[PDB]
């Protein structure tokens, strides 16, 4: 299967209640392995997966140092963004940043990414070539001018094609039992009357990993996508994921309806039936 390493950063200003709250997390695929919280007592980058705990003191020290440097850089960003947008001191605002890399089945580099948002909206993103910038409004054009003059793309590119992939492979190796696994969904459908003339059909997928899955309802082979309630894929808390899709059907037409489950752990996609 293909793999990814991504780091996620959130900084939130807090007018007159001290400094911005900064939270960082790192993931390999859908498995979190580090956190930093600016409000916690430890002030340390902390392990959140068992296979990261073996990393020695240099690692923890280096990641604590770098994570703090990411935090200070976001504190500055919040100030700068309030000036670009002519915003007052009176309101809380949010900067988010995400970066990392994807590798293919052969663990070779596929793609790199480095994206910022302000107040929930795209701000600036490194393009696919790792040489250029997409800036989403006029303020972010000011950032693009500054980042081009300072050759920011080049330094990001060297990390994303090089270091990022090297550490992803190392984590994949060390955490092989956890990370190089696929757990196929355990599927079923439930049936419950909502009146004497309608029933809720709900198609379930349980205990699966990774999180990526497609659940779809058909009526006589036709997709029921506008009539389907699809919940967001959710963690079970044990390292696996769950999802369901439901339709409300007239009683008596159950046999017309089929659920269709697609997941990388399934040898073939499954069709579940009421007959």
């Amino acid at each position: 299967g293909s793999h990814s390493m991504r780091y996620f950063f959130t900084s939130v200003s807090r007018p007159g209640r001290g400094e911005p709250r900064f939270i960082a997390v790192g993931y390999v695929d859908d498995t979190q392995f580090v956190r930093f919280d600016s409000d916690a007592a430890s002030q340390r980058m902390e392990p959140r997966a068992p296979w990261i705990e073996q990393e020695g003191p240099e690692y923890w020290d280096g990641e604590t140092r770098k994570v703090k440097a990411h935090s200070q850089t976001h504190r500055v960003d919040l100030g700068t963004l309030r000036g670009y947008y002519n915003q007052s001191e009176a309101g809380s605002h949010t900067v988010q940043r995400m970066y990392g890399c994807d590798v293919g089945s052969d663990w070779r580099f596929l793609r790199g990414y480095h994206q910022y948002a302000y107040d929930g909206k795209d701000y600036i993103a490194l393009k696919e070539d790792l040489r250029s910038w997409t800036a989403a409004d006029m303020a972010a054009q000011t950032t693009k001018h500054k980042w081009e003059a300072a050759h920011v793309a080049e330094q990001l590119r060297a990390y994303l094609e090089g270091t990022c992939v090297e550490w992803l492979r190392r984590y994949l190796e060390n955490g092989k039992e956890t990370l190089q696994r696929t757990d196929a969904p355990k599927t079923h459908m439930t049936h419950h009357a909502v009146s004497d003339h309608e029933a809720t059909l709900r198609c379930w997928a349980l205990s699966f990993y990774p999180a990526e899955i497609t659940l779809t309802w058909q009526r006589d082979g036709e997709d029921q996508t506008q009539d389907t309630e699809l919940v967001e894929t959710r963690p079970a808390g044990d390292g696996t994921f769950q999802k369901w899709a439901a339709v409300v059907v007239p009683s008596g037409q159950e046999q017309r309806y089929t659920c269709h489950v697609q997941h990388e752990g399934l040898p073939k996609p499954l069709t579940l039936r009421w007959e």
């Binding site: 780091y7 790192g26 690692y59 280096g62 990641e63 770098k66 994570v67 990411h70 850089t73 500055v76 960003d77 700068t80 963004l81 670009y84 900067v95 970066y99 910022y116 701000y123 600036i124 972010a140 950032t143 500054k146 980042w147 920011v152 990001l156 990390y159 270091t163 990022c164 550490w167």
Partner: peptide, 6 residues
């Protein structure tokens, strides 16, 4: 492992 102001 981890790796600029706007």
């Amino acid at each position: 492992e981890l790796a600029l102001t706007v």
